[PDB]
């Protein structure tokens, strides 16, 4: 959550969390997240539950684009950068980072892939650098009219409007197939 640097959306970085106790109450009551939309699990219900592992996929998008991060949602980013499964179970967190990501002159460090031949499968990360081909004639390789770099830069500005203000997004994904990472609670002696 407090990472010094956040990976680009086209290279959204996914981390593994296991063998620990996750206290989601502090996250829920922090109130610092523009976002805590939880699908399949009530946000104030994960303290009694637990899972095999937690998948934390972190990236950065525009504030207006955060909506595209949802199951069964159609959009450029949701289709060619990060697609969630229709039956996704987990929770999406989004919080504004304008002050930590916007600088005078345009912060172009954030990049997002736009053009792709086919829509991405769920949780499919595409790092291909191939030049998108919108014409019958392959270029092999001089970019130009209608032959493409498939990536574009956000160019966040300090004065950019909200829809254009940066937002750091972390998607927590859970799968239940022995329990490893369980939240906060106590044990008792066995009785037969």
């Amino acid at each position, epitope marked *: 959550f407090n990472a010094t640097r956040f990976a680009s959306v086209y290279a959204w970085n996914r981390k593994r969390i296991s063998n620990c106790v996750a206290d989601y109450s502090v996250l829920y009551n922090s109130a610092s997240f*523009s976002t805590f939309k939880c699908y399949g699990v009530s946000p104030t219900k994960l303290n009694d539950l637990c899972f095999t592992n937690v998948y934390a996929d972190s990236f950065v998008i525009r504030g207006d684009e955060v909506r595209q991060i949802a199951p069964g949602q159609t959009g450029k980013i949701a289709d060619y950068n990060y697609k969630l499964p229709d039956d996704f179970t987990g929770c999406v967190i989004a919080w504004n980072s304008n002050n930590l990501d916007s600088k005078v002159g345009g912060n172009y460090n954030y990049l997002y892939r736009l053009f792709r031949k086919s829509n991405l499968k769920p949780f499919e990360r595409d790092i291909s650098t191939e030049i998108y081909q919108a014409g019958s004639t392959p270029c092999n390789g001089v970019e130009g009219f209608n032959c493409y770099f498939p990536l574009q830069s956000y160019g966040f500005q300090p004065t950019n409007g*909200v829809g254009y203000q940066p937002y750091r997004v972390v998607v927590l994904s859970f799968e239940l197939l022995p329990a490893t990472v369980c939240g906060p609670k106590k044990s008792t002696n066995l009785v037969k």
Partner: nanobody, 120 residues
Framework: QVQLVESGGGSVQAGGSLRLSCAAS????????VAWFRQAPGKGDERVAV????????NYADSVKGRFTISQDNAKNTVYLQMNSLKPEDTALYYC??????????????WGQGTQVTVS
């Protein structure tokens, strides 16, 4: 299909009052819950207040309780935040967000350019 525009900010003395407006356009029927949040440059997002349009229930940040009041005008399709006894801590950009349901902070979206309030 839903737009929210914030207005009514400005510069006031400590202990002054301002009255911030969130005008909504489009088909806002689905969004029952509306919230006001603020962000100073250095700090992160915080929700000052939220209201349930249908029920009328309200929630307030502990700091703002007593000084801030949230109201709505259905004919105007606007949600209003009344700031009394403004304090220097109140200085930040203010925006209004909206969502179908109140469980989480994200489902609120559609917030506009925002309004700047400075207390000095």
């Amino acid at each position: 299909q839903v737009q929210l525009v914030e207005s009514g900010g400005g510069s006031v003395q400590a202990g002054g009052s301002l009255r911030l407006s969130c005008a909504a356009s489009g088909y806002t029927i689905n969004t029952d819950a509306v919230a006001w949040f603020r962000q100073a440059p250095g700090k992160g997002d915080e929700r000052v207040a939220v209201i349930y349009t249908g029920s009328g229930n309200t929630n307030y940040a502990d700091s703002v309780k007593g000084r801030f009041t949230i109201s709505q005008d259905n004919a105007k399709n606007t949600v209003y935040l009344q700031m009394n006894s403004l304090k220097p801590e109140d200085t930040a950009l203010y925006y209004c967000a909206s969502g179908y349901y109140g469980a989480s902070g994200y489902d609120f979206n559609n917030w506009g350019q925002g309004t700047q309030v400075t207390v000095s």
